[PDB]
UniProtKB/Swiss-Prot annotation:
It is linked to Lymphoproliferative syndrome 1: A rare immunodeficiency characterized by extreme susceptibility to infection with Epstein-Barr virus (EBV). Inadequate immune response to EBV can have a fatal outcome. Clinical features include splenomegaly, lymphadenopathy, anemia, thrombocytopenia, pancytopenia, recurrent infections. There is an increased risk for lymphoma. Residues 17-77 form the SH3 domain. It comes from Homo sapiens. Homooligomerizes; this association negatively regulates kinase activity. Interacts with PPIA/CYPA; this interaction regulates TCR signal strength via a proline-directed conformational switch in ITK. Interacts with THEMIS. Interacts with FASLG. Interacts with VAV1; this interaction is important for VAV1 localization and TCR-induced actin polarization. Interacts with TBX21. Induction: Through a myriad of surface receptors including the TCR/CD3 signaling complex, coreceptors, or chemokine receptors. Subsequent autophosphorylation at Tyr-26 leads to the kinase activation. The autophosphorylated Tyr-26 lies within the substrate binding sequence of the SH3 domain. Ubiquitinated. It is found in: Cytoplasm; Nucleus. The chain holds residues 162 to 239 of 620 of the full protein. The N-terminal PH domain allows ITK to be recruited to the plasma membrane by an activated PI3 kinase. This domain also contains a proline-rich region (PRR). The adjoining domain is a SH3 domain, which binds to PRR (from itself or from other proteins). Next, a SH2 domain is required for binding tyrosine-phosphorylated substrates. In the C-terminal region, the kinase domain is required for tyrosine phosphorylation. Signal peptide: none annotated. This is Tyrosine-protein kinase ITK/TSK. The modification Phosphotyrosine is found at Y26. Tyrosine kinase that plays an essential role in regulation of the adaptive immune response. Regulates the development, function and differentiation of conventional T-cells and nonconventional NKT-cells. When antigen presenting cells (APC) activate T-cell receptor (TCR), a series of phosphorylation lead to the recruitment of ITK to the cell membrane, in the vicinity of the stimulated TCR receptor, where it is phosphorylated by LCK. Phosphorylation leads to ITK autophosphorylation and full activation. Belongs to the protein kinase superfamily. Tyr protein kinase family. TEC subfamily.
């Protein structure tokens, strides 16, 4: 392989390392308005974890609702030296 215009991959993220960002392992679907359909391999801003089985999140476009925390996952840690004790 060979580069073309730029040989330096500087693809920075969008969300913030401070806000809780979760991702859906699978594309969840529902027939209720109160519920939101998650997308496989898609991050989501955690609004409030009031409940346990159901977490309130928001899409990148602006779609919030109740989703199965099971699908949502905590963006694995990286280059972060911190201990929760």
């Amino acid at each position: 392989g060979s580069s073309g215009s730029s040989g330096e991959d500087n693809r920075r993220p969008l969300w913030e390392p401070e806000e809780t960002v979760v991702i859906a392992l699978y594309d969840y679907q529902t027939n209720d308005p109160q519920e939101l359909a998650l997308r496989r391999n898609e991050e989501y801003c955690l609004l409030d974890s009031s409940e346990i089985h159901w977490w309130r999140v928001q899409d990148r476009n602006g779609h919030e609702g109740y989703v199965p925390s099971s699908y949502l996952v905590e963006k694995s840690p990286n280059n972060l030296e911190t201990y929760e004790w």
